[PDB]
Subunit: 249 residues, 4 copies
């Protein structure tokens, strides 16, 4: 109950790491708001989470949804203590194959929406609030046909370093969670349309991890929860990497 | 001499680091193509640079401009051995004042334009060709009111890591030069419209450099020439930081 | 509570960050063993820590002291779930003034002793155990007259990356906590004897931190406790930096 | 080329591998070069092969008296040191659980301590604008099984440069690090094992890890050192230049 009385917002709360984080934060007693593009997924996530967790339908890439979303927080809670942005996506294109549409979607969802989600949240955020940004080991490594995604993740990590100085007067601290390969619908979907064909991709990714297993999303969620808590009071601008050792070695 | 028989393209060749690089590569005997947005600057720069340098006026953000430039290179020379991207800008906005136009302008010019300048270049590029991307120590550090610029530079550096894998069969190597503070019209203009205003800004920036001086653009150009030459044959996906020690300490 | 039923050893437990870590781990319910070089200081530390805290007098550099330490832990608790190495020192010598004793003393305590504390600890450590090494932002930054200390800290961080692979079959995970400037007797001692000289030095160091304060040792201790806990299950070979943003910017 | 003409360079560990290739490249650029080797016969072959105004001093960098004698020949002869490259370093393998005190002591004394005191003793000879290049490794920033001690030593070398930027800033000397990836050297070969087949299999496997797919020729690393030694690196300080074929970048 360490986060009791703390209000948290998770964009992309309906699946994967954000889902597990919303669940983990709710266990701490934090009132949690989650966003999804699709109502039924949001309803299932809210029903699954329960624990005094509210859900707002919202696409981060449009300002009106972001305005309506924070207007909902101002009318209901009116203070945001924890912010986690999980609304990002990954798609594969090798160089020479990269479409302008493919670049625009990746950076708008992965970078621009993070910028404006944070910017719009700031008036609601008191001094001592914690912001956790969605990073990746893909931001600091090389992966074939994934250059656009990796560049977007590296950009997210860079925002935190400068935002440390911009938010210093406001007492808000920004930190980055960088997951390694984690068992998620998004990872499995990347593997393929076939069920066993995607499963083979997951088996390969586990082989690349030094400890030899994919992460359960809860293991990543614990890192976000730790950054959300007051235990991270002296952590600012830092990247915490949960990869099983993959990028460390 | 060292780079004779080699064809080089420098986007943003008219000013600053790109101009000094055009001068250096031409001195090595390379044929150089430089791009500028303004014809009078492009003409004047080509006049001074020499017989080897030719100039095409293009806005890297325009897909038509990029297509036009590469097509002239295909008919004029027929191959591209060296590519250096220097078409990039910086503007200041603190978090809470970041405008959508400010985000789009910087990311389209610093990141999107790099992706498609490189993509359009590839058919011209032989085995053993060298690509140099413009990075910054801002990509790896925090600067107040420059978060969007730093994020764009970090994305540029990340692109090179994945493009190593994309380009490995083609035999093209990608690297990043990351300048610290360099005396350029662009750096002076961030300082202010007043000349005491630029002089005060420039002196303060030199106080930040451990060796105590701003770089001359030629000192950055020397790094590009090294990466462009065959001496850098075992360097791939790396970042070479020339900052006077500022980010190193 | 969370650490209930876990045995933890903290070398250099009597003062500063090690003391705060011993208190936090015991508060979480771990049985804690602390090491001190000097008997009188060690007894006072154990008494303040009180229940759940045992003391062994040992110097990390001596090997017989390490043997005696692990023999008593084996005879009493019989296992070691958590290991945190905090027995390390910093001394001042500019290049051109460094002595052989100054090099040997730093590396024997900061690096060599860590290697052998970890090696002798391994037989006691079960599968799933957590090891935390003492790093510093000094490992990844430059500080005048502190080169030997920074090199020792960089060596410490590097050990963890390889030790992930050495330890993968044993199931033991290694991570590094890197503090920024933390209010400690040692740090005040580095400022000097004059109490005013210490206060002036501490005030100067706080000016370097972006958030503008030195850390309380408990703020570092929380990081070690997080890494010690099962929440850090997917973290391996990683460095978590608690610096108030100093090295992140 | 004569880019380095009139410059005096010292390469410790000059008789073999990257150090030998560097001495050759510096000498071709017109520098006067001094190389050190532990063994007289090997040193003589290197000096004879290098030719071009290269002088050899037989010394062990771990011995303080050898270092004093070495810098005494430079003071008596050239009178200055413009370029310093430290290549006298070794790697041996021991996994955690088998690391011996002698294995730790030998690695850190040669890879780190000797570097500190080679540089310290060189400084009075080095004028403003002199260039120091330290030998690093991608092993310093990565994980390799049974090579933790070696990797720690290289990470220590890279850190020394960041602080030495500040220590040396009024002297005007700049310190930088070259970090090679896998480079075809007798040391690297010998690390594979006594058998030629053992060396060949290990060498072929390491090449598979390199993204460009080949080990480096030592000259490819030497080119990086010459760049750092030259005036072109005037704005580079405290930096690490990694020539790894892309291995650590990806």
């Amino acid at each position: 109950k360490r986060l009791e009385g703390k209000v948290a917002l998770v964009t992309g709360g309906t699946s994967g790491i954000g889902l597990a984080t919303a669940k983990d934060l709710a266990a701490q007693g934090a009132r949690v708001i989650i966003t999804g593009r699709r109502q039924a997924e949001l309803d299932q996530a809210v029903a699954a989470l329960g624990q005094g967790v509210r859900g707002v339908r919202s696409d981060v890439t449009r300002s009106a949804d972001l305005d309506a979303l924070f207007e909902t927080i101002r009318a209901t809670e009116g203070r945001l203590d924890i912010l986690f942005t999980n609304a990002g996506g990954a798609s594969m294109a090798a160089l020479g194959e990269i479409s302008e549409q493919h670049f625009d979607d990746t950076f708008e969802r992965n970078v621009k929406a993070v910028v404006f989600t944070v910017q719009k949240a700031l008036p609601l955020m008191p001094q001592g609030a914690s912001i956790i940004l969605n990073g990746s080991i893909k931001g600091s490594t090389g992966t074939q046909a994934f250059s656009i995604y990796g560049a977007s993740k590296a950009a997210v990590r860079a925002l935190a370093r400068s935002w440390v100085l911009d938010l210093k007067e406001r007492g808000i601290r920004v930190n980055v969670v960088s997951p390694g390969s984690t068992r998620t619908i998004g990872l499995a979907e990347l593997g393929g349309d076939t069920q066993e064909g995607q499963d083979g991709t997951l088996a390969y990714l586990a082989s690349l991890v030094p400890i030899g297993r994919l992460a359960d999303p809860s293991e990543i969620a614990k890192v976000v929860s730790f950054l959300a808590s007051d235990d991270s009071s002296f952590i600012n601008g830092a990247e915490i990497t949960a990869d099983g050792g993959q990028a460390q070695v």
